[PDB]
Amino acid sequence: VSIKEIAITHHVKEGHEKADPSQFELLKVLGQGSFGKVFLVKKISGSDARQLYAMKVLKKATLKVRDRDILVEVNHPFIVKLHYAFQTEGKLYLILDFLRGGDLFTRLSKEVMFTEEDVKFYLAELALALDHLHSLGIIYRDLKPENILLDEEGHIKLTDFGLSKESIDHEKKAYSFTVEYMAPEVVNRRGHTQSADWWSFGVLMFEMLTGTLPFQGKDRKETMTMILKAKLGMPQFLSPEAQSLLRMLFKRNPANRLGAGPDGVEEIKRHSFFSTIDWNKLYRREIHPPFKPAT
Amino acid sequence: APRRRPPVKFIFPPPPLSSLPGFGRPRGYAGPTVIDMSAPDDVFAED
Ligand SMILES: Nc1ncnc2c1ncn2[C@@H]1O[C@H](COP(=O)(O)OP(=O)(O)NP(=O)(O)O)[C@@H](O)[C@H]1O
């Protein structure tokens, strides 16, 4: 059951030059997260001079790993890559890939009308990224649409890789208190298991295909009650393959959930829903995304 | 042709769940119908 906390203090490609605040120039604010604003920075020194990066500013960040650098191992085709990490004046600075494709939910909203096969492509790339973190013992924990971005080519890019973060004092909230994608065990505070991510995966699949969240409440308290006790009627516009995957994913006992069996993620890959996906070609980014961002 | 799918639009930077209690949202699929609060292991009722 062993869990190890790795504090994120400094990072740079092995044999490369470590970065510091003077080497970046701020350009704009990319977006607003729970832990603060995300910035666009331009490297002004070194071999990657003129390159654009995304920057997060935190008090500290740790990576919880259960069961080569971990920051290098988490590198994946569909996960943001951390290029630099440095600490200054009691603040942690994360230099990340600048994701130029925008978020998936805005792209889907721009289309308005799309097919299940369109959403299938993004879910499949999302599934590979989640399993890669699972393979190294990392849990995504708090998977939400804000973390699901696209790159210039239109491929999925997760904005984080399971980091446990603490915001700076300026961003600090008075009450720490998102439950909509949380698994029942998480609501029960029974522990966050790797099957919890596949529950969050299912809620995203439901929301992307239906446009609505499966459990809707007025406040945090009510929605938590719905996650634990609600029985839902399957939307009938969904395909039989999609309904089957949702039913296998939406099981309140973690052990009954798809992906928690002995084969693990290949349970989900082999499902009837993802039948049209060539997973190896998908990993090689040789399958074109349904929508290109530049349009 | 596959089964007719609903028009899907999202609000990015989703508004917080706590706020906006009675504000109506634009017309789309209302959501899954809650058949009961039986707390069954299988969230979806079998067809
Ligand atoms: N690498 C990036 N490139 C471009 N935009 C980014 C990047 N990372 C984050 N953003 C933008 O900033 C928003 C917030 O990022 P996010 O990773 O969700 O922040 P956070 O601090 O981890 N809080 P949260 O995701 O709610 O737990 C995203 O929805 C994007 O719009």
Residue numbers in the entry:
A (entry chain A): 45 to 111, 119 to 228, 231 to 348
B (entry chain B): 23 to 69
Question: What do the study's own words say?
Answer:
The Kaposi’s sarcoma associated herpesvirus protein ORF45 binds the extracellular signal-regulated kinase (ERK) and the p90 Ribosomal S6 kinase (RSK). ERK and RSK are key downstream components of the epidermal growth factor (EGF)/Ras/ERK pathway. RSK consists of two kinase domains connected by a flexible linker. To understand how ORF45 forms a complex with both ERK and RSK and causes persistent activation of the two kinases, we determined the crystal structures of ppERK2-ORF45 and RSK(NTK)-ORF45 binary complexes.
To reveal the structural basis of NTK-ORF45 binding, we determined the crystal structure of the NTK-ORF45(16-76) complex at 2.75 Å resolution. The asymmetric unit contained 6 NTK-ORF45 complexes and 47 amino acids from ORF45 could be traced in the electron density map. ORF45 makes contacts with the C-lobe of the NTK. The NTK/VF-motif crystal structure showed how the valine and phenylalanine side-chains snugly fit into a small hydrophobic pocket and highlighted the importance of other neighboring D/E residues involved in electrostatic interactions. As expected, binding affinity decreased by ~100-1000-fold when F268 was changed to serine or L285, M287 or R305 were replaced with alanine or with bulkier tryptophan/phenylalanine residues. The NTK(WT)-ORF45 interaction has a slow on-rate because of the structural rearrangement that needs to take place before VF-motif binding since L285 is incompatible with F66(ORF45) in its original position. The VF-motif binding groove by the αG/αH region at the bottom of the NTK C-lobe, to our knowledge, has so far not been reported as a linear motif binding surface.
